[PDB]
């Protein structure tokens, strides 16, 4: 490892914790709400 | 036949409402009616937990 | 922290403070006095539980300020989450979009409540493959942490896979009576670390257990939201915009039909509950007659009524009636009457409140805010509380005083002296 | 604000540390223990932990209630809701009145949401699917400061497809949302072509991941129309729908339990605040029965914010009613749930200080002389007949070439306009003559 | 038989520089409504 | 000054509506002059309130100046081949041949344009309006290309109601506008004052004028009470011959 740089490695270590960072917060927010009525409910008093 | 009215404007005003994103809110997490359809009892309840 | 329920005008409430034999305590679950008015209230609440009788009126009537929203918001607390309470005003049946009598149906279904139980198979796993040879044949690999199977598919099968995207990596229920795909999350793999994310997109760890499981739900849904979902085709949205309008009595009775049908069944159970329009003096006769008759079904809930009027006239009418309500569903109803407050109850109610805003009052401030309460209003002494608190939090001190209940009786006025002060200035005021 | 409203010099109620009242400060004269009462509602409206407290604002025209009312949101701030309305706005035709009384309410409580935001903007260098349908996208912006590689959720791609996404376009991508607005080509293309109906935007200056940590403040109304319509949405149905024409509803008090329960969610989580605000309404006496019966309920609940009212109407007809008369034009039982605050009327030199004040605001040079005739005559008609000679009497002067207000102008500017009492008497003098 | 006196387009609204994702949303609404509605509207041909 | 109120009183035939009438010529076109009657504010389609803010939002304009590149001549030569295509366009002083893109010859194939008509280009939006043919309106003289000025002046009203709902515009010339909400109308108020602080801008406070103003009923009155007090409330006039 010649060419290896200690700052380009540690820029792209600290960028990939920022993304899995951001993926999990993410994954939290988009199944953080719970229907009023949900899809069962509805599909159960929807008469033909 | 007559030719359509051509009404013109201030190119500013269609961009009124427009908010840029980083100078508002997701409001989709309060989006309860977009779960409807969409999202289940089974989900919510029993699989996220 | 603030939460967006604050400390309001019946929040030190809980309940109707009675024992077993439905005999009121003197200071119980936050209530003083009003003995005989809070053991009617339990009676109709033992009514209600039992929920064997349908249609049944009661009418809280007494002089403002004598507890009679006390008592119905006791009965409410009293009564369970799992039993609607449906709290109108007599003012919100006046609607531009449904008649009033339409309001009143849908305030009475509001009211019973439905508990559906549903229990289905599903399919739950993550898709491993997904192969389709030609959209005619094509097989599905599905995987949970202990199990992995592959499955035919079929045409209908591989067009619903088609229309939701269904990819590898995607974690799906299916279900086995309709068919129907429902994304719950995908799997997270080294190669799915997005920068950027859809609105809908979610990571979710691969199910475990088996590859067949069953979903039961269980839910309270009422009469009203039922008709609503079957008013049109996407009626449920009407359940979030209110825009109903006048739901066909077919609609209804097929409705209460397929209700009937749940319940012999098993699928369902009935809970009815409490309907308390409060201030029902605003109803129009037009209303009052169609209550008559409304009560009379057999799918009617408990309707609970609160009155501060006098001999006054129906609204609607050029007619006197005892309560503004006309005799005829006078003579349908049970009258529950509130006497007034003591000085003893008054100091009591007072104390409640203090301990309920967190303020610590003298003794001498307790006479002076009874005998101010006594002499203007309740409500008055109630308000005076919060203001002296704030005052002596100002001045720096800890313990409200007299001094602070008098600077605050000289600078918010009663209804008494501000009458006075302008009937002094009576010609600088517009239209006397 | 650049043009001078009517309240323009209220800045505040003018209390001292002790909430005693000054005599003049921030542009209020007099009314020191309305004043007073109203930096008491003010410490309330503070201190969180209350809700429904109800507030009557009771005197004579034109004694200060909407002035100290303002006083109020400006002693509250921006950051605390104040809603103004006007008693006779509750008759819409699309809603009933109550349903109007209870989105007030809700637009009264506030909501502050802390939230950083992540966008993703630059010219658009590379646009590969990467192909397993679609695994991901692998996109390349470009901004001043450099080029980043981006890996794309797939859902993206159809949203890149459908804005018409591009090399050479300068676009933004919303990290939370996935949303893309291609906002124009990049200027380096614009003589790519001699005549393209094109919109050519400048390369973005900054990085291309910009992040920033807002504080917006939203009301529960604001989700409660969020949440009362769809939005979106492939189907007919829903593309139909967004043909329709957009007609206010009488939102359900589910969809307002459940806002209240996800509200409390967030405030539970530590990303939200409430701020429960102010709710203001001038000329209460424009209600109906019906309305006052929905406040009775309303301000007993305990979601509601503090209601400030206000009336100048003395012992009259409620305006529902056929002949029941009250205090206020109010019910004595809605006035029995609220706090009275009593404006008085003004002394000479009250108003001399008024006609000062408002003088100084407008930037209007006024003599000694001129300010004792002006008193003087609000003395006789009224302040604000006073306040408004101000305005046409400096345009006189300056027509005449001086720049101060003199006697002569202020006696002009009478001459030529008129107050209520003397038209009252030239049309009492004049029966016949004019209409009936 | 009865035809209207006088038809016209509906009145456009122009800008100078409008956004440029106005327009095109437009077209694809438009697009997307007519691919799924005109097959539906050929009934009232002859009306037409 | 916002939210002045005049009324002119006196007996009928006295001169009332022709002193309005002179003030709505002493000022130009630029400032918004709007004239009502008192019966136009009761509708079936809105509000009294809802009408009478619409009333005074139509009174303030909103001047915004922006530049645009107009090319105003005679077509010469199109070509249009599979997308590539030239166009040639002729001044009676200079000819010039253009390298036409993708979007402006779509433009350019919607709207028939042959040779020897006389169109203006708007380069922005591909604005194409044919303003006769010539070989009737002669072709135009100087330079081809030319750098405009458009000012446009917009009431608060026209704002709301085309930020209102998509291809909302239509409700400025069919009614159909409802009631708009409140906060859309603050919103558009906040970024006026945004515009006009950044210098994007330049507010235009105009009359509102209700002849007969007598016909308003006490809510009507109510609510103009507190909506003079606005900051951008425009100057009302009124006019009433009643005892
Ligand atoms: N028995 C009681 N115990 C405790 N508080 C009471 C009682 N009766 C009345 N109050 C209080 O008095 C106030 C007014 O009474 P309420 O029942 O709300 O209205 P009304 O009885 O005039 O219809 C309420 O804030 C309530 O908390
Ligand atoms: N105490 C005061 N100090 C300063 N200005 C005042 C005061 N009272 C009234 N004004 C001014 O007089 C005008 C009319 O008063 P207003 O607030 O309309 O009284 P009300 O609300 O009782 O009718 C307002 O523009 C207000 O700014
Ligand atoms: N001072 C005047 N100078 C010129 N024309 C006038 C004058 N007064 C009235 N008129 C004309 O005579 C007619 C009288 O109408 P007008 O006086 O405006 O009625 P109103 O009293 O309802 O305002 C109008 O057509 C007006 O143009
Ligand atoms: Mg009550
Ligand atoms: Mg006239």
Redesign the interface.
């Given at each position: 490892s010649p060419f290896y740089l200690d700052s380009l490695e540690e820029k792209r270590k600290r960028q990939r914790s920022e993304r899995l960072e951001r993926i999990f917060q993410l994954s939290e927010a988009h199944g953080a709400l719970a229907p009023v009525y949900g899809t069962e409910v509805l599909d159960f008093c929807t008469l033909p | 036949?007559?030719?359509?009215?051509?009404?013109?404007?201030?190119?500013?005003?269609?961009?009124?409402?427009?908010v840029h994103?980083?100078?508002?809110?997701?409001?989709?997490?309060?989006?309860?009616?977009?779960?409807?359809?969409?999202?289940?009892?089974?989900?919510?309840?029993?699989?996220?937990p | 922290v603030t939460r967006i329920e604050r400390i309001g005008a019946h929040s030190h409430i809980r309940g109707l403070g009675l024992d077993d034999a439905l005999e009121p305590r003197q200071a119980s679950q936050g209530m003083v006095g009003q003995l005989a008015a809070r053991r009617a209230a339990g009676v109709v609440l033992e009514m209600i539980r039992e929920g064997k009788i349908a249609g049944r009126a009661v009418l809280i009537a007494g002089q403002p300020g004598t507890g009679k929203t006390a008592i119905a918001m006791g009965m409410a607390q009293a009564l369970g989450p799992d039993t609607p309470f449906t709290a109108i005003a007599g003012s919100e049946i006046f609607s531009l979009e449904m008649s009033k009598t339409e309001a009143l149906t849908q305030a009475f279904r509001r009211s019973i409540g439905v508990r559906i139980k549903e229990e289905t198979e599903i399919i739950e796993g993550e898709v491993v493959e997904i192969q389709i040879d030609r959209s005619k044949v094509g097989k599905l690999t599905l995987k949970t942490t202990e199990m992995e199977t592959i499955y035919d598919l079929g045409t209908k099968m591989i067009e619903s896979l088609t229309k939701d995207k269904v990819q590898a990596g995607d974690v799906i229920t299916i279900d086995k009576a309709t068919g129907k795909i429902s994304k719950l999350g995908r799997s997270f793999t080294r190669a799915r670390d997005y920068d950027a994310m859809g609105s809908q997109t979610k990571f979710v760890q691969c199910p475990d257990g088996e590859l067949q499981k069953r979903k039961e739900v269980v839910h309270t849904v009422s009469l009203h939201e039922i008709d609503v979902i079957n008013s049109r085709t996407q009626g449920f949205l009407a359940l979030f915009s209110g825009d109903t309008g006048e739901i066909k009595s077919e609609v209804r009775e097929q409705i209460n039909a397929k209700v009937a049908e749940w319940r012999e069944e098993g699928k369902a159970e009935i809970i009815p509950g409490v309907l308390f329009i409060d201030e029902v003096h605003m109803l129009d006769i037009e209303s009052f007659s169609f209550l008559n008759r409304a009560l009379e079904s057999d799918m009617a809930p408990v309707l609970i009524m609160a009155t501060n009027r006098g001999i006054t006239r129906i609204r609607g009418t050029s007619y006197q009636s005892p309560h503004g309500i006309p005799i005829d569903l006078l003579d349908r109803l049970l009258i529950v009457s509130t006497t007034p407050y003591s000085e003893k109850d008054t100091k009591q109610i007072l104390r409640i409140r203090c301990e309920e805003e967190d303020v610590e009052m003298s003794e001498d401030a307790y006479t002076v805010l009874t005998r101010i309460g006594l002499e203007t209003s309740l409500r008055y002494a109630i308000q005076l509380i919060t203001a002296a608190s704030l005052v002596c939090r100002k001045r720096k001190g800890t313990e409200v005083q007299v001094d602070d209940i008098k600077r605050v009786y000289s600078l918010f006025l009663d209804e008494s002296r501000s009458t006075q002060y302008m009937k002094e200035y009576q010609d600088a005021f517009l239209f006397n | 604000t650049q043009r001078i409203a009517s309240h323009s010099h209220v800045k505040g109620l003018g209390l001292d540390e002790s909430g005693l009242a000054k005599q003049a400060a921030s542009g209020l004269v007099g009314q020191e223990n309305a004043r007073e009462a109203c930096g008491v509602i003010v410490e309330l409206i503070k201190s969180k932990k209350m809700a429904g407290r109800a507030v009557l604002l009771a005197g004579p025209p034109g004694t200060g209630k909407t002035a100290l009312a303002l006083a109020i949101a400006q002693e509250l701030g921006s950051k605390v809701p104040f809603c103004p309305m006007v008693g006779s706005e509750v008759y819409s035709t699309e809603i009933k009145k109550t349903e109007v009384l209870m989105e007030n309410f809700r637009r009264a409580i506030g909501l502050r949401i802390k939230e950083t935001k992540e966008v993703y903007e630059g010219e658009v260098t590379e646009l590969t699917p990467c192909e397993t349908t679609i695994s991901h996208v692998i996109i390349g912006l470009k901004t001043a400061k450099g080029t980043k590689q981006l890996k794309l959720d797939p859902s993206i791609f159809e949203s890149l497809q459908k804005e018409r996404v591009e090399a050479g376009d300068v676009i933004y991508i919303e990290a939370n949302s996935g949303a893309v607005k291609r906002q124009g080509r990049c200027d380096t293309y614009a003589t790519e072509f001699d005549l393209e109906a094109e919109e050519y935007v400048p390369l973005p200056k900054g990085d291309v991941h910009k992040k920033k940590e807002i504080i917006q403040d939203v009301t529960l109304h604001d989700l409660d129309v969020a949440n009362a319509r769809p939005q979106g949405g492939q189907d007919i149905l829903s593309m139909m729908g967004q043909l329709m024409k957009p007609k206010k509803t009488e939102i359900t008090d589910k969809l307002r339990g459940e806002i209240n329960k996800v509200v409390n969610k967030y405030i539970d989580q530590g990303i939200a605040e409430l701020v429960p605000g102010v709710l203001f309404v001038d000329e209460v006496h424009m209600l109906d029965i019906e309305c006052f019966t929905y406040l009775h309920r309303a301000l007993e609940s305990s979601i509601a914010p503090i209601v400030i009212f206000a009336s100048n109407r003395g012992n009259c007809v409620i305006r529902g009613t056929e002949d029941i008369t009250s205090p206020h034009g109010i019910p004595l039982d809605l006035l029995d749930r609220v706090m009275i605050i009593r404006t008085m009327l003004y002394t000479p030199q009250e108003m001399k200080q008024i006609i000062k004040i408002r003088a100084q605001t407008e930037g209007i040079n006024i003599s000694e002389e001129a300010l004792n005739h002006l008193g003087e005559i609000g003395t006789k008609t009224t302040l604000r007949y006073s306040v408004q000679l101000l305005t046409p009497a400096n345009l006189l002067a300056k027509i005449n070439g001086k720049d101060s207000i003199e006697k002569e102008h202020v006696e002009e500017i009478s001459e030529l306009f008129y107050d209520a009492k003397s038209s009252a008497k030239i049309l009492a003098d004049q029966q016949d003559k004019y209409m009936k | 038989f009865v035809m209207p006196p006088v038809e016209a387009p509906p009145p456009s609204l122009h800008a100078c520089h409008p956004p440029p994702w106005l327009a095109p949303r437009q077209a694809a609404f438009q697009e997307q409504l007519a691919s799924e509605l005109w097959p539906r509207a050929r009934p009232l041909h002859r009306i037409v």
């Open positions: - | 036949i007559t030719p359509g009215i051509c009404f013109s404007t201030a190119s500013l005003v269609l961009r009124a409402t427009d994103p980083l100078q508002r809110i997701d409001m989709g997490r309060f989006d309860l009616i977009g779960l409807e359809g969409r999202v289940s009892r089974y989900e919510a309840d029993t699989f996220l | - | - | -």
